[PDB]
């Protein structure tokens, strides 16, 4: 009988690599439905901060109004979640908008002529000709502004090219940003590409010694197949550096003495972050939000 | 968000059409996975659509004028102090002209004119089922030597046209198709790398449509999307000796993907690998 | 028109890798292959974003009806 | 000798400033040749 302690004595983790932007770890003998539930809940359910409403004042720029509001919405922010809780939508906006629900970032840029010796880059022809993401000045307001005194609201990338300006054109606006889940609008998704893959298993049916392994090793990445000498038949170094391409199936020499399979139990996960999350805490919240989705039904009787 | 074709004709650069991009490039996955396509109809990714996947705008121009004629001027723009209803400042100024960048529905004031004969200011509203944005207003007064007074203003509207479900996207090979459903990336099948295809085409169209170019540019565009090169189409350069599936196949072989182009995919709903590999590539 | 951000297929931010890409082509005189690999774009979904962008905004701005030519 | 490829550092150069010399792309100008050439010859040529 399958039990939790019988699955716990077999379940293991193997973190292959880790970084402040991307982490790649391995899960041993876990079910595909549970692994797919983790990936599916990581790409959709994890909350994030993003611009939700736009209040424009002057958009004389050549870039259209709704397009600028579209790009400002897509601009990611390095704002840690769980500081601003969820906001209701049924009540009117005049009291729905509080400092605890949303935080506001402003933008006020004007372009003027700058004389210089003339094909020439616009960096020395005008003033503030290109408005980057760093120009989005967060506005500390409301009841609690000390919560951001440690780390200010900074966009995830200050080099994002939002718009370009010309003399006589101005940009004045205030932007309200709230939290949201990726299912409503995928701009709230802090993950770049949440995906997993099965470890490609390779079976050796016949001896590969001789010049056969000299051409067999190059069909795969060099780090996959290892050779010792003319004897001691070649083996595999590690099946994790092997990208599944089925290159050996084209040759009739290897089409009979090798088989490419899949380990239905060993998964590897490689997750990225947009800037508001970390690849470790977002998986910690992944198992937590799934632990919350089903516990919400555990302590809940049935109706009818 | 128009882009140039990865695989383009040799004369596409000679014509200077790079100045006018007419389409974009995205990852095509020829699958029947979803099940909402029993024809050449396609399915876009909802996560790609919310990022600007094929974003377009419309521009209308209406010339509103009050001049019927040598005759004395009767209608006058602006406002007369005789009588006035309220709630007309949110759309117009004090001169009877609308502000720039205001959202107008059908039944909203767009330009108000006063008339001295009927001693009553009446509004002529914009009537169109699609509510648009106000972009430009042009003041023109002419056909007169020394007497000037405006009786013709050219208002210009812009229509935010987000690509909804129901529009007609198509490739450049006659592959007609209407958007069946905006499939979200939550249940979209993900490849070995982790990219979700923003378009799905039913493979059952090819036997009747009789098209192979969109296949060969799905490998050419895939090779170019890795090596950075831009393959040139320039038809009548390939023959039975060197087939394009082989010439473009060796580039995928030395790139790290499959020689034929069949990339191993993973299903979205259950999560296990599909039976066979999925044909993946990019098409303009 | 303007350089896109949050590539449709993958989702990685790309709008911040356009001017730095033009610098890698003009200054270092590199090829399109290495100039794309240096910016940190491994997947061909986000690679083709700025590898093929036209950036018509540099030509739309030449029409400024608010100041003398 | 890569292929018949495109270019960005050279196309964006045209987007910065149009050439003060003759019009670039000397192939699209021949597309209106039957139109502008016919109306040109209406006044151009000997005897008006």
């Amino acid at each position: 009988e399958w039990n939790v302690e019988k699955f716990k004595k077999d379940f293991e983790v193997n973190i292959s690599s880790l970084d402040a932007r991307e982490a790649n770890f391995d899960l041993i003998n876990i079910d595909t439905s549970i692994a797919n539930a983790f990936r599916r809940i990581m790409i959709s359910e994890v909350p994030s901060v993003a611009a939700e409403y736009v209040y424009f004042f002057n958009n004389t720029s050549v870039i259209q109004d709704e397009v600028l509001a579209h790009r400002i919405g897509l601009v990611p922010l390095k704002v840690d979640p769980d500081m601003l809780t969820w906001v209701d939508s049924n009540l009117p906006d005049d009291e729905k908008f509080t400092d605890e629900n949303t935080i506001v970032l402003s933008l006020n840029v004007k372009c003027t002529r700058n004389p210089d010796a003339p094909s020439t880059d616009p960096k020395e022809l005008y003033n503030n000709a290109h408005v980057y993401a760093r120009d989005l000045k967060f506005e500390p307001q409301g009841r609690q502004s000390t919560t951001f005194a440690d780390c200010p609201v900074v966009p995830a990338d200050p080099d994002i090219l939002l718009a370009k300006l010309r003399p006589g054109q101005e940009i004045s606006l205030k932007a309200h940003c709230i939290l949201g889940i990726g299912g409503d609008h995928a701009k709230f998704s802090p993950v770049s590409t949440a995906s997993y893959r099965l470890l490609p298993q390779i079976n050796i049916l016949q001896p590969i010694k001789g010049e056969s392994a000299r051409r067999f090793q190059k069909c795969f990445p060099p780090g996959v197949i290892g050779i010792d000498e003319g004897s001691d038949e070649a083996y595999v170094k590690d099946a994790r550096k092997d990208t599944v391409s089925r290159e050996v199936l084209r040759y009739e020499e290897f089409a009979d003495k090798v088989k490419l399979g899949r380990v239905r139990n060993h998964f590897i996960f490689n997750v990225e972050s947009a800037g508001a999350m970390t690849p470790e805490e977002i998986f910690f919240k992944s198992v937590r939000i799934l632990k919350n989705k089903a516990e919400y039904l555990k302590n809940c009787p049935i109706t009818q | 968000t128009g882009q140039t074709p990865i695989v383009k004709a040799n004369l596409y650069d000679d014509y200077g059409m790079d100045n006018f991009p007419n389409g974009f490039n995205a990852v095509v996955a020829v699958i029947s996975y979803t099940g909402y396509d029993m024809d050449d109809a396609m399915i876009i990714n909802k996560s790609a659509d919310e990022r600007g996947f094929g974003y377009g705008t419309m521009y209308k121009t209406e010339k509103v004028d009050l001049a019927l004629n040598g005759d004395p001027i009767t209608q006058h723009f602006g406002f007369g102090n005789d009588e006035w209803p309220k709630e007309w400042l949110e759309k117009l100024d004090e001169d009877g002209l609308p502000y720039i960048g205001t959202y107008v529905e059908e039944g909203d004031p767009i330009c108000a004119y006063f008339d001295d004969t009927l001693n009553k200011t009446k509004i002529k509203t914009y009537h169109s089922s699609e509510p648009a944005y106000i972009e430009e207003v042009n003041l023109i007064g002419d056909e007169s030597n020394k007497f000037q007074e405006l009786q013709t203003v050219s208002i210009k509207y812009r229509i935010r046209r987000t690509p909804q479900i129901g529009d007609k996207f198509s490739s450049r090979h006659g592959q007609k198709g209407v958007c069946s459903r905006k499939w979200p990336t939550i249940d979209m099948p993900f490849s070995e790398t982790g990219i979700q295809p923003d378009i799905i085409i039913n493979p059952h169209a090819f036997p009747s449509r009789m098209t192979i170019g969109m296949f060969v540019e799905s490998l050419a565009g895939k090779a170019g999307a890795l090596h950075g090169i831009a393959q040139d189409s320039t038809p009548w350069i390939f023959n039975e000796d060197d087939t394009p599936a082989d010439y473009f196949g060796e580039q995928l072989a030395k790139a790290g993907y499959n020689y034929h182009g069949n990339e191993p995919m993973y299903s979205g709903a259950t999560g296990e690998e599909l039976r066979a590999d999925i044909y993946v590539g990019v098409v303009y | 028109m303007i350089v896109p951000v949050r590539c449709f297929s993958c989702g990685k931010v790309v709008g911040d890798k356009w001017e730095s890409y033009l610098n890698l082509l003009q200054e270092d005189e590199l090829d399109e292959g290495t100039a794309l690999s240096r910016l940190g774009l491994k997947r061909y979904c986000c690679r083709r974003m700025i590898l093929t962008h036209v950036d018509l905004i540099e030509k739309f701005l030449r029409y400024n009806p608010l100041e003398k030519r | 000798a890569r292929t018949a490829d495109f270019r960005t550092l050279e196309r964006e150069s045209r987007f910065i400033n149009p050439p003060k010399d003759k019009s670039a792309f000397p192939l699209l100008q021949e597309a209106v040749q039957p139109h502008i050439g016919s109306f040109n010859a209406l006044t151009e040529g000997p005897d008006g």
Binding site: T243 | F238, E250 | Y44 | -
Partner: peptide, 24 residues
């Protein structure tokens, strides 16, 4: 007829999801 000029100087520009161009 001369064959189509093959693009020269190409390497492996793709690897596993968590492995970079570390293998020569």
């Amino acid at each position: 007829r001369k064959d189509v000029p093959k693009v020269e100087g190409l390497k492996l520009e793709h690897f596993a999801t968590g492995y970079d161009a570390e293998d020569f």
